[PDB]
Design a protein around this ligand. Sequence first.
Ligand code: 5WI
Ligand code: AKG
Ligand code: FE2
Length: 280
Amino acid sequence: RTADLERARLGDDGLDFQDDAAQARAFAQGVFLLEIPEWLDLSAGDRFARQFFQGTGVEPYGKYRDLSSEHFGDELLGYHSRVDQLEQFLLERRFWGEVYPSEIATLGEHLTLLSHRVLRSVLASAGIPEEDWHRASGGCSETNGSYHLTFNHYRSAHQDIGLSSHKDDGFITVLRTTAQGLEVNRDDVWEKVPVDPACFVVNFGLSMEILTSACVTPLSAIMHRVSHQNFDRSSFGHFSSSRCLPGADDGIYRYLPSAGLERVCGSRELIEENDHEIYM
Ligand SMILES: CC[C@H](C)[C@@H]1NC(=O)/C(=C/[C@@](C)(O)CO)NC1=O
Ligand SMILES: O=C(O)CCC(=O)C(=O)O
Ligand SMILES: [Fe+2]
């Protein structure tokens, strides 16, 4: 019922697991734990996740309930009530400094850098040539990707599942969870992800799976869900995707030594299709 995940930490040369077999298990499973740097403050983000849905009466973050997608010219952004228990506030990096509270934008920038370092370590381990990283990652091997800082609240009063079974769209997801509910389907059995408030949960998205499908050890996008919540639950995540601007899409690529990078689809196209798959 409970999954046992490999634990890593960011070191001087990148991702440090206990050994090479632990990294090989972690990358093949598509999910692992990443120790949270002692200097990285998560307390403002935790409070934002507990508050964003409550409206302007609740300070300092309740007012973000009133910011819908029309405010951003991007239908994916802002407050969203989902068909599951989940309600969300999603915002891409181009809007953080202007729209998010100053300390929330700061959290997003720091998570972008941690995710940047995690991704470059992964691309090296997958055997992708370094000179192809920028195009292969749609900019995420540097800081030119699309990055969403997304806050999640599970309304326990709503029936049925917390968040439907799915895979993330992008390359790297850095997930901050302090309560039970997350479940992963490694192999073919659903398993609870253990709670560890000292670690992020890291997993790969669909773009990573597509990118590394022909590699020596292909990396998969883990299927995961949030079980029905009988009490309220909150969380937040940092998502790294190939640059998917409404007018500036970087596309999704498969790497093959015999051919280089072959375009598969567009980045926003993958996101819109996935959101349609996730919520039936
Ligand atoms: C790349 C932009 C998207 C919106 C980003 N990637 C995801 O896979 C996503 C999935 C859900 C389950 O959280 C949305 O319901 N969340 C995000 O923030
Ligand atoms: O809330 C969680 O623990 C998981 C949320 C999630 O998987 C997502 O928002 O994509
Ligand atoms: Fe997810």
